Amino acid sequence: ASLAGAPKYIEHFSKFSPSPLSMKQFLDFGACEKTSFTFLRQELPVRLANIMKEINLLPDRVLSTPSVQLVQSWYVQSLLDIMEFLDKDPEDHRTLSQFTDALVTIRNRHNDVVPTMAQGVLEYDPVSNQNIQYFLDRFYLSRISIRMLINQHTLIFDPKHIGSIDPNCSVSDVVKDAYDMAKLLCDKYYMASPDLEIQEVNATNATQPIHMVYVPSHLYHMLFELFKNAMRATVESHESSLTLPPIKIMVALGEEDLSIKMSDRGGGVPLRKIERLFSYMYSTAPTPAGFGYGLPISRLYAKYFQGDLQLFSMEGFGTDAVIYLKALSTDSVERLPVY
Amino acid sequence: NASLAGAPKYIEHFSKFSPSPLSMKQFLDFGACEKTSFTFLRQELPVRLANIMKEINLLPDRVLSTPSVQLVQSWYVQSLLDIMEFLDKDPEDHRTLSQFTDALVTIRNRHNDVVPTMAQGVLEYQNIQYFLDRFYLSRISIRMLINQHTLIFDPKHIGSIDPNCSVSDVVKDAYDMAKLLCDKYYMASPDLEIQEVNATNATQPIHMVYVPSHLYHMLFELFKNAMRATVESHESSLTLPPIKIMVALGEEDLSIKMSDRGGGVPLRKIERLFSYMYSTAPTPPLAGFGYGLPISRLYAKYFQGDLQLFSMEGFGTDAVIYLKALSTDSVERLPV
Ligand SMILES: Nc1ncnc2c1ncn2[C@@H]1O[C@H](COP(=O)(O)OP(=O)(O)O)[C@@H](O)[C@H]1O
Ligand SMILES: Nc1ncnc2c1ncn2[C@@H]1O[C@H](COP(=O)(O)OP(=O)(O)O)[C@@H](O)[C@H]1O
Ligand SMILES: [Mg+2]
Ligand SMILES: [Mg+2]
């Protein structure tokens, strides 16, 4: 559309606040298309103008980076493209198929938003107020939630999953799948990697495998990112590829929490440096894993449905990464930056 | 006891100064001499007292006006006045020194119950948390100083400080004491398992320069909780999960982990645990005080460390005491 109105467009949708959807609200779409449209055509412009508003809030030295604009360029196009629809008849086959088509386009378009934003923060002209952290947590939680919305539509309308959501998800399988992927990268690089051990303790069901209502891709993302960190730490901390300590996983289901602990003997980190580990600016790796966003982003994924991710180390010994999730669908509610 | 009518003026004076934290080596440095101690204590002690007493009144009218609280305050006033008498006595004089240690002893015995007394004061019932952390941190610090002079000036240790402190040894002593209380209450308690990974040299017992009683107390407090949580979570006395200890020594940190299979606590409640107002046991054996965790964490912070609890609901909990491994980094931390 007319792209001069864009200022006016954000000032308007920015006046609205995000409306979090519960898992039951997400799950109950079998609801209908005109439901996913009617609501998406107002909700996404609201979500996109809110976070673009925070994008001209960036430091004039990162804002001017090329990569930064690129991604801004994507968002101005992805608000207009959905505004083309704010008047169309939710009742004809093509308004509906045109929307899904638009959505396909926006999701493919933003698939490199992080490696790109990551190039706007790498290439950036030093160090005192890296207020790049605050925005990026917010920028990336908003991004996950928009990709949530889009994928659900695009999947539901284009195991037995309702969108990207699996109602009976085997934590263990996700963990194994994510171990396999991570390990493949390790071996292709160091030609060595620790083994894997899985443990379960179902407090709610003393003998039944732990399953849950969740989005496997999100879990895979967390577990993968963490496994990569743990195999690196392990490898870099030993000498003999024949005696590398296995990575141990512990799955605990309680009445309120679903807890996953990834323990390694990767040498640990001083208590002094544990908050650092989440710095978008911090990475102990030979630059371009080694783009230091693996940890803040994974936590943003845990916090997205009322979870969290915390790391506890013992210098000289190893480290404990724990993922905390809500056990009950009833508690899994969408988390977003202030709205 | 100076006349207590000058009390308002004395606080405002020494409250104008700031505490000066000593390094672990400055403590060790007293083998300088007593006269140095006396001359530094008679300035430092009033400074730290008047500083924390001036915040005692920053308390809410509700809790300050509690007899337990007002009773503690009366103690501090008297201690301040007791010390103040040595402000113009001859340091080079034999009597003045042995009179000072005579006075510190009186103060130390008089404050011996400040915590359970404060506690009965809280019982008379939440920023309270902010005050209490600082109050109790300052108090551990004032007890540090008093104990150094009394023990040093009147067997390898330099006061309460052991230069070759065996972490496992303290861990054992704390497990046994705690263990004793439990059995006498539940008549069942976990066993204990200890492991160490001396990263810095690989097969030697981890030792450190530290205050054995401080480490003891932290480990003592934590052991009770884990053995309790474990008893409370299980139904069989012949199959009770042992408590596991990990001692890790690295270039910067000295790490002690106490892992228990006591069924743990939801993530929503972890902050609570360090609340002076929080306890899962009665107001009263083994538990009920509800300050075992916050103070223990205060002991850890004192010489620049920390105490952190991590749980997995349904399984168990990890309690970790972090210290500095190097004496060069251990300087006492203190409230204003
Ligand atoms: N299990 C671990 N043990 C020791 N250090 C770790 C571990 N997890 C991550 N770290 C540290 O935190 C840094 C940043 O983590 P991450 O987000 O995965 O970034 P990246 O892998 O791109 O460096 C790593 O470079 C590493 O030094
Ligand atoms: N290892 C543990 N497992 C589960 N809960 C614990 C553990 N540690 C402490 N807690 C909880 O935190 C509360 C407060 O801890 P604490 O300071 O020791 O107080 P108190 O023992 O007087 O209740 C306990 O009542 C208990 O419910
Ligand atoms: Mg990484
Ligand atoms: Mg206790």
Curated annotation (Swiss-Prot), chain B:
It is found in: Mitochondrion matrix. Activity increases in response to increased acetyl-CoA and NADH levels and upon binding to the pyruvate dehydrogenase subunit DLAT. Inhibited by ADP and pyruvate; these compounds interfere with DLAT binding and thereby inhibit kinase activity. Inhibited by dichloroacetate. Inhibited by AZD7545; this compound interferes with DLAT binding and thereby inhibits kinase activity. Reactive oxygen species cause the formation of disulfide bonds, and thereby inhibit the enzyme. It is an enzyme of class 2 (transferase). The modification Phosphotyrosine is found at Y185, Y186. One of its GO terms (molecular function) is ATP binding. SMART domains: HATPase_c. ATP binds at residues 221-228, 260, 279-280, 288-293. GO terms for biological process: cellular response to nutrient; cellular response to reactive oxygen species; glucose homeostasis; insulin receptor signaling pathway; intrinsic apoptotic signaling pathway by p53 class mediator; peptidyl-serine phosphorylation; regulation of acetyl-CoA biosynthetic process from pyruvate; regulation of calcium-mediated signaling. GO terms for cellular component: mitochondrial matrix; mitochondrion; pyruvate dehydrogenase complex. Its EC number is 2.7.11.2. Keywords: ATP-binding, Kinase, Mitochondrion, Nucleotide-binding, Phosphoprotein, Transferase, Transit peptide. Detected in heart (at protein level). Highest level of expression in heart and skeletal muscle and the lowest in spleen and lung. Liver, kidney, brain and testis levels are intermediate. It catalyses: L-seryl-[pyruvate dehydrogenase E1 alpha subunit] + ATP = O-phospho-L-seryl-[pyruvate dehydrogenase E1 alpha subunit] + ADP + H(+). CDD domains: HATPase_PDK-like. Residues 123-327 form the Histidine kinase domain. Coiled coil: none annotated. PANTHER family: [PYRUVATE DEHYDROGENASE (ACETYL-TRANSFERRING)] KINASE ISOZYME 2, MITOCHONDRIAL, PYRUVATE DEHYDROGENASE KINASE. Kinase that plays a key role in the regulation of glucose and fatty acid metabolism and homeostasis via phosphorylation of the pyruvate dehydrogenase subunits PDHA1 and PDHA2. This inhibits pyruvate dehydrogenase activity, and thereby regulates metabolite flux through the tricarboxylic acid cycle, down-regulates aerobic respiration and inhibits the formation of acetyl-coenzyme A from pyruvate. Inhibition of pyruvate dehydrogenase decreases glucose utilization and increases fat metabolism. Mediates cellular responses to insulin. Homodimer, and heterodimer with PDK1. Interacts with the pyruvate dehydrogenase complex subunit DLAT, and is part of the multimeric pyruvate dehydrogenase complex that contains multiple copies of pyruvate dehydrogenase (E1), dihydrolipoamide acetyltransferase (DLAT, E2) and lipoamide dehydrogenase (DLD, E3). Belongs to the PDK/BCKDK protein kinase family. This is [Pyruvate dehydrogenase (acetyl-transferring)] kinase isozyme 2, mitochondrial. It comes from Rattus norvegicus. The lineage of its organism: Eukaryota, Metazoa, Chordata, Craniata, Vertebrata.
